[PDB]
Symmetry: C3
Amino acid sequence: QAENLPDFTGLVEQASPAVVNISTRQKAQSLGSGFIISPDGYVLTNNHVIDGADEILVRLSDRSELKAKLVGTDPRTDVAVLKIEGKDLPTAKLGNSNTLKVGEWVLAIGSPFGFDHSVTKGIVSAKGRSLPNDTYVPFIQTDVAINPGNSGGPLFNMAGEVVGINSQIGLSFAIPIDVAMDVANQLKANGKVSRGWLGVVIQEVGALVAQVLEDGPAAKGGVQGDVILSANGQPIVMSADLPHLIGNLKDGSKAELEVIRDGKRQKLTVTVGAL
Amino acid sequence: ENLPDFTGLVEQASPAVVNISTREAQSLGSGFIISPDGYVLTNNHVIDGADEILVRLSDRSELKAKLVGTDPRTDVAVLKIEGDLPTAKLGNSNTLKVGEWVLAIGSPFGFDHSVTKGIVSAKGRSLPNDTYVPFIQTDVAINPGNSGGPLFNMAGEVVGINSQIGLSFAIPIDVAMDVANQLKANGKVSRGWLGVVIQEVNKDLAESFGLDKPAGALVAQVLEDGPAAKGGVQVGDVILSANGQPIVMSADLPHLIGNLKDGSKAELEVIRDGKRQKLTVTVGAL
Amino acid sequence: AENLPDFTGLVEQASPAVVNISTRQKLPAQSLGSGFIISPDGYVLTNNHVIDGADEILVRLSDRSELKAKLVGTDPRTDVAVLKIEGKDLPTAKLGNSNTLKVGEWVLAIGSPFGFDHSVTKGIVSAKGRSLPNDTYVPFIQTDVAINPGNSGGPLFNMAGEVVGINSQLSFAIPIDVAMDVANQLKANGKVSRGWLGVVIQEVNKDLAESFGLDKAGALVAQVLEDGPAAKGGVQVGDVILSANGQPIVMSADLPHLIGNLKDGSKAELEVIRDGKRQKLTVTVGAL
C-alpha cells in the first residue's frame, strides 16, 4: 500500500518558489516567512514577523536579496504587506478559504532560516470566528507541525492555492486567505485598516453585552446587560456575528441595533466610531 | 491531489462527539455518545472534581449529565443525558494494526469540533511505571480539550478513547467498553488485587531459579496483610502460573488477577530458590 | 468514506531490524534509545548520544533476545555510533540513498523506545541541507514525524522500506549516505579522521560582498585562528575563500566539508580575496 501513497513532492516543487524569507539587519537575522502574491513584488506576511524591524530584507529561492518597504500592517488580524522590486517574480496562486473543509489535506511552506524552504503537511482541524478569549478574528486550525520561522508563510491546499497564512499562534493557526486578502487590499489602498468600533465587550447567549463602556459610543445609546439580536437588520446567531458587522461599518455611520433587556424589545441607534 | 482525505469521515463521525463542561460554562474536555438514549463516554480526569456536568452537542443543544460511573485506573467515565441522539459506532481495538490511519475528534472549547489525523504508533498493556491498563499510542496531534473524545478508524468506528495523559495515548475501546458495561451495571469497577508489586523478567535478574526463558513476574516488593502474605510469598518469587494461565508477560499477571472475583482463591505456581511450588491466596479488592 | 494507503505492511517488513539500546550500571533495565541492524552478523547503527556514558551496552530485539554489544566506534560530530553483537542471519535493514530523497516524500520512523516493543511514526521530508546558523558542517534531513523519547538512534524509512536516515532529533535525521560513510570509517579504523580548518567562517550575503570588493559566494573567514594550519599559511580574517584545491565554494559549508575529507598533512591550495586583490595560499592541513 505505502508505496502507492501520494505525496507532496510535485506540490512542493510547484508551490515553493513564491515563499520567501523575511529578515532584518542591525544598523541575515531571520524574522520569519512570507509569500509573493503578485509578480511585481507585493508580499504578505504576519504583522508579528516584521514588528520592530526597520530595514526589511526579502530573500528568494534563487537567493536574491531584496529591499522591502512596509506597505501596511494590521495587528488585529496579524497581517502585513511588504513591497519589493522585481518583474515577473514567482507568485502564489490564491484560493478560497471559505470552501476549505475540515479534514482536507494542506501543506505549509516556510523559509525559516535563510533562503531555504521547509515544508510540513497536515489537515484542516477546524475553522471558526471565535475563541474564549476573543470574539473577532476568524481562524483555520491545522495539525501541521509547528516551526519557528515558518510563521508568515502560506498554507496550501493540494491544488497549490494559498488557503491561509500560517501564523504560529498543539494545533497551529492560520489566517483564512479571504480575510487576509481583504485586509491586504485595504492596506494596499489606504495603508491601514479601518474598522467600525463599539464600546462593548460581549459574550454569547444573540450577543450578550457583558461589559458596556463609559465614553464608548454604545453608552451614548444604551447600557449594559442587553442581548443584541440584530444590528442594522442582520440577525446575530453568534456573538461573533456582531463585531465583524460593526467592524465593517464606517466610522460615523448610524447603526440601528435591536436589544432585549427584560423581555422588552427596543431599538437604539449609534454613530459608530473607529479602533 | 489524488490523495484521499478525511472530509467524509469527519461528516459521518463528528455528530456524536460532544463537549464536556462544568458549572458561564467552563469546558473540561470531550466525549462521545455510545447509545441514542444518552449514554456518553469520556475520561475520568475530564470530569474529576466537577459537580454540575454539561454536555454540549453539535446542534448547540446543552444537556444536563448525571455521572453514571467512573474508573480512575482506566480513566474511563460514563455520563447520562436525556434525549434519538447521534451515536458513534464502536469497533474492535484488538484488531487495530500499528501503521493504520486514525482520526481523533474532539469538541475542545464549546459546541465546535476539532479534528486531527495520524497513525497507530504502538499497542500494549505495559509501561515502565505501570502494568494495569493496556494502551494504544498514536502520533495524532495533542490538544487540550480533545481529551475524552473518540479515536476513529477510517471506517468511522471508535477504536479508542483519546486520553493523551511526544506521542498521544488512547484507551483501547475493548477495555473502555468492558469498564463501561461494568460502570453502567454496578456503578464501580470491582477489581481483584494482589499485594505484591512485580517487575518483568530479563536475563539479568534470572537467578533464584533455574528458569532459562525470560518470562513470569518478578515480585519486587511483597506486601503485608495482603492475602498474598497469607499465601506465603517472599520477595524474589517468580510467579509463572496464576490459576493455570501462563505468565510470559509480567502484565499477564495483573489483568488476570484484576478480573478475578474478590474472595475467590487463586492458586499460583512460583519458583523460590530453584524449587517449584504452589500457594493459594484469597484475592481481595483495592 | 475515503481509504488511503497505510504503513502496516511497511511496519511488518521494516520493524524486525529496529532494536532497543540499553545499559545496566547505576544506583536505583535502562533503555538509552533505538538503533538498527545494518548487517546479519550483528553490526548495529545508532546515535553517539544514545551510548555516551554507558558502560555495558545491551541490544534488545523484537523476538525479545538480549545481546551484549561491543562499541565498534563513535563519531560525536555526526552523532553516529556503531555497535557489534553476536548472531547469524539477524534481521537486517535495507539501506537506501539519502541524496535522492525529495522534500515532500513520505517517511516512517521506527524506534524501540522502552523494551522489546516497537513504536512507529509517519511524516514527510520537510527539508534537506548541510548547514544551519549553529553549524557549518553536518548535513541534515528534517521531517515532521512525531518526536519521541526512545526513538532517537532508530532508522528513518522511505516507503520502500530502505533506510534513508538515522532519526537523531521538527525532527532531525542524519542522511544515511553520511552515516554509512561514517560507519565504514568507524568499522575499519575505530575513529573518523577529519582535516582541520584553522578558522571559523561565515556566509557571504550582498552586504559583505560589497564590503571587501567581492563581486557577486565563497566563505568569508569570520575568525582566523592561532596555530591553525591556515595561520601557518597566511590567512587574515575577512578573507573570502572561493576555491580550495580547485573546488568552487558557493556556500561556506562547501569548505569544512572539503577539508574534512582531506587527509591530515596533505596539500591545501586556497584562493582568497584580500582587500580586493586575488591570491593563493598553501596550507598543511591538520586534524581535530
